[PDB]
Design a protein around this nucleic acid. Structure first.
Ligand SMILES: [Zn+2]
Length: 854
DNA sequence: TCGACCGGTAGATTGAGGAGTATCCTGAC
DNA sequence: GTCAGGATACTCCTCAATCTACCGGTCGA
């Protein structure tokens, strides 16, 4: 890595460089700019004087750039002044400016340290060191000091927005083109100034703006793309290229390869969008044909930053990680569907036989480590630090794998290694608490913040270490901890909250957002809309509480005046994870469900008042006509199966079982719903058929549904032609006919008990546990098979019957004598457990038993 | 001590998808 | 010397599903 033009000087200067502390690798890295090789070797002892505590890595980084020697010579005679009154610069910021900005940027910051920080601009030192530390920062600084008043006054741009526009490589061009294109992009094409500033704050913002001005009246009026999609495509490095290829590769990818336009937009709205689109066009048939992938898998691989490399690497390495290392294609696609998936996938190929053998891991654990945006670094750090953490700190290997299976991964793991002997000895924590803080996205920041703030929040604010650890043990606990330290004196002393409520609000995902929103909205929601602080805190004490609380502000009068809901019902809908979605969906769907589908507002509120109440409501809208017309389920049963947490998957599974499952699965699913009568006869005699039809008629009239004589004749024919057929009468009236289930009870599955009740004529009735009588819910044997048989005997005129069940644990203890309460006078009920019944507890009965009445 | 083949409510924990922030390297002129 | 495009790593916020823990009325032991 040494050029022939450089060797004749590196050989001469190696003798001088060695002895100051420079290794040969540092010499090779620094030899990119030959002029530095002398300048360091003659002045090193001086520079460490001008820049105390600047390691050799920093010196190499500064001196190896395009103007490293000049940058170091400038920092030699400029670092004295920038550490003075105007800017409070230290060594780190000086090296940050000189490494990236260069000698020109250092000189510019030196000469203009007064005007930039002075009154007319009011730039903080951080903003100056962020504008200056970029490739060509002197031009950006001059352009800012020339154009800040104009943008901040004439165009209404915040100084933070202008600094974010200038804090990029093409900062000068971006500023000088925003200043001339804001009147046009925000008046003719209808973009908000925030959209233009989001477009322009990128490495090529001038090109992106200049090409959006042309491709808004083309990619919208012809290709059918919304302005939000265009301004999300263009808001990335080199967005001009992404737009120019979406202009020509949208007809092809949406016609030949059959990609949805939203899929193409999702592919293109990334840093290297053009390259990803071109390589998808090249590699879609090959990957979907030879390597067995589906188009959705390829789109999910390519919808990521630098997805061309990930896609090509999958093409190259899929026949190897599936044939030699044993990973399945789903796992390879999961590894590669991330940022820098090429590196993760190559590192898995390299290290999977090493981590899984020398360190005791398993392929699933390695794949779970690698399936993140920094999987290569996490895997390498795990291989480095498993011998160290697991014995010098006690962390069990699953704890290390849980720490590293996150987006940070390497950072959190190194920080844990550095900070376990501190937090566990001085601040009084335990390793479990540290591993709980660190097992999140950005746990290095959380750990450092806890170390810095635990002595403060525990004395000045009155909290406790458990509360601080609960606040910190989330994604972005640094922000929640800082905002708690900032706002607890205000929230707990002005609005009337208490530290318990503030800690409950903060102990969530976006706790900083929810806490600031509560500060902003509590003097409003409890003054105009009529809520109370307890209701607002309950709305806010969830993930995304800012969204839910703002949505409540927006939709309390609309919901409470257009649809007749009470404030309590709106608050109950909102007091859940995802309450914004639930509230918006309730607004959208309350009339449709209430009128077209024959529901009530209370049923819609009950469906929506659950975690995932938007999915559970759209699913009900989609599936109610199918279930209540073909399968005979009443709307009440659908409402009660959807009014549960996670009630979309349950309803979908019920539909799948009813549509294509085996007959026994349909039978059990239909019994597990409600008041259905599952009758079966023994022979074809007239008396038995009449008894079965009589029982069916009584059950039907118990539910208030009248059976037509045609249905009676059909049932009679079915019973008179099919021996062993099962008639299952659902509450709505539909009579399912199962021709062949079994003649024996199903195997016990540990959850639902089955049972068959036999009368004196051979008629058999089916029962399962659960769904007890609502008027006997106080009893401890409500929903047990024996109680169900007792109540069935009580309702009709049956005085001698035998119920067989299949629970291997035997008869309950509660049914020991409370079952005799439900039988009428003189009634005889014989419970029979299975052959292998054993008493699993102190009171179970596992033998044939007889109960009488009272 | 003696019992749920129950259900309802509250907090907790696991997983996924989206968006924003930050740094470094290559090529062109 | 500045500018444009591409790849990789880390931190923060929102939504959905599942899991776990606790508790009650009423009857012989
Ligand atoms: Zn029982």
């Amino acid at each position: 890595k040494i050029k022939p033009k450089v060797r004749s000087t590196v050989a001469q200067h190696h003798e001088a460089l060695v002895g100051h502390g420079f290794t040969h690798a540092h010499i090779v890295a620094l030899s990119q700019h030959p002029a530095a090789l002398g300048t360091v070797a003659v002045k090193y002892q001086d520079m460490i004087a001008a820049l105390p505590e600047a390691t050799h890595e920093a010196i190499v980084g500064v001196g190896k750039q395009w103007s490293g020697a000049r940058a170091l010579e400038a920092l030699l005679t400029v670092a004295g002044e920038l550490r003075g009154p105007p800017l409070q610069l230290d060594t780190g910021q000086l090296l940050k400016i000189a490494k990236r900005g260069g000698v020109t940027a250092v000189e510019a910051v030196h000469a203009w340290r007064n005007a930039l920080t002075g009154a007319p601009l009011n730039l903080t030192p951080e903003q100056v060191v962020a504008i200056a530390s970029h490739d060509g920062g002197k031009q950006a600084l001059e352009t800012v000091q020339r154009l800040l008043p104009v943008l901040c006054q004439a165009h209404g741009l915040t100084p933070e927005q202008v600094v974010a526009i200038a804090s990029n490589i093409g900062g000068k061009q971006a500023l000088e083109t925003v200043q001339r294109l804001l009147p046009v992009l925000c008046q003719a094409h209808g973009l908000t100034p925030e959209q233009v500033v989001a477009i322009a704050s990128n490495n090529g913002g001038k090109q992106a703006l200049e090409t959006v001005q042309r491709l808004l009246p083309v990619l919208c009026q012809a290709h059918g793309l919304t302005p939000e999609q265009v301004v999300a495509i263009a808001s990335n490095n080199g967005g001009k290229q992404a737009l120019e290829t979406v202009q020509r590769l949208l007809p092809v990818l949406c016609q030949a390869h059959g990609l949805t336009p939203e899929q193409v937009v999702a592919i293109a709205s990334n840093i290297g969008g053009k390259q990803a689109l071109e390589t998808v066009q090249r590699l879609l048939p090959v990957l979907c044909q030879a390597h067995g992938l589906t188009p959705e898998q390829v789109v999910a691989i390519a919808s990521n930053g630098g997805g061309k490399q990930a896609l090509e690497t999958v093409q190259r390495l899929l026949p190897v990680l599936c044939q030699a290392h044993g990973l399945t294609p789903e796992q390879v696609v999961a590894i590669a569907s991330n940022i820098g998936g090429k590196q993760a996938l190559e590192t898995v190929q390299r290290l999977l036989p090493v981590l899984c053998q020398a360190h005791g891991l398993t392929p699933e654990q390695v794949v779970a480590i690698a399936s993140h945006d920094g999987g290569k670094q996490a895997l390498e750090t795990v291989q480095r630090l498993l011998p160290v953490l697991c014995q010098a700190h006690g962390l069990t290997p699953e704890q290390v794998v849980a720490i590293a299976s996150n987006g940070g991964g390497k950072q959190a793991l190194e920080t844990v290694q550095r900070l376990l002997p501190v937090l566990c000895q001085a601040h009084g924590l335990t390793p479990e608490q540290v591993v709980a803080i660190a097992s999140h996205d950005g746990g290095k920041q959380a750990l450092e913040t806890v170390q810095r703030l635990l002595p403060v929040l525990c004395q000045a604010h009155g909290l406790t270490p458990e509360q601080v650890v609960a606040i910190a043990s989330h994604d972005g606990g640094k922000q929640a901890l800082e905002t708690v330290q900032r706002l607890l004196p205000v929230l707990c002393q002005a609005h009337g909250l208490t530290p318990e409520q503030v800690v409950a609000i903060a102990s969530n995902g976006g706790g900083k957002q929810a806490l600031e929103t509560v500060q902003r909205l509590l003097p409003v929601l409890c003054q105009a809309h009529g809520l109370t602080p307890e209701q607002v805190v309950a709305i806010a004490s969830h993930d995304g509480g800012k969204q839910a609380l703002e949505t409540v502000q927006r939709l309390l009068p609309v919901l409470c005046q257009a649809h007749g809901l009470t404030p309590e019902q709106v608050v109950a809908i909102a007091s859940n994870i995802g309450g914004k979605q639930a509230l918006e969906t309730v607004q959208r769907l309350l009339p449709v469900l209430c009128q077209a589908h024959g529901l009530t507002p209370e049923q819609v509120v009950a469906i929506a008042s659950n975690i995932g109440g938007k999915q559970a409501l759209e699913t009900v809208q989609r599936l109610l006509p199918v279930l209540c017309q073909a399968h005979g389920l009443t709307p009440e049963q659908v409402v009660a199966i959807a009014s549960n947490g996670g009630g979309r998957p349950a309803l979908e599974a019920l539909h799948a079982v009813l549509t294509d499952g085996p007959e026994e699965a349909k039978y059990e699913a239909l019994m597990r719903l409600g008041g259905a009568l599952a009758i079966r006869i023994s022979d074809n005699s007239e008396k038995q058929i009449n008894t079965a039809i009589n029982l069916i008629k009584n059950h039907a009239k118990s539910k208030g549904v009248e059976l037509s004589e045609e249905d009676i004749k059909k049932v009679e024919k079915i019973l008179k032609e099919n021996p062993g057929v099962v008639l299952l009468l659902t509450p709505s009236g539909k009579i399912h006919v199962f021709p062949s289930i079994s003649w024996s009870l199903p195997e016990y599955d540990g959850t639902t008990t089955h049972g068959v009740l036999v009368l004196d004529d051979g008629t058999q009735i089916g029962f399962t546990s659960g769904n007890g009588d609502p008027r006997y819910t106080n009893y401890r044997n409500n929903g047990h098979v024996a109680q169900k048989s007792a109540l069935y005997m009580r309702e009709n005129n049956i005085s001698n019957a035998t119920v067989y069940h299949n629970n291997t644990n035997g008869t309950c203890g509660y049914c020991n004598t409370m079952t005799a309460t439900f039988l009428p006078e003189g009634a005889t009920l014989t419970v029979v457990p299975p052959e292998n019944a054993v008493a699993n507890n102190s009171r179970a009965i596992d033998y044939v038993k007889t109960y009488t009445g009272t």
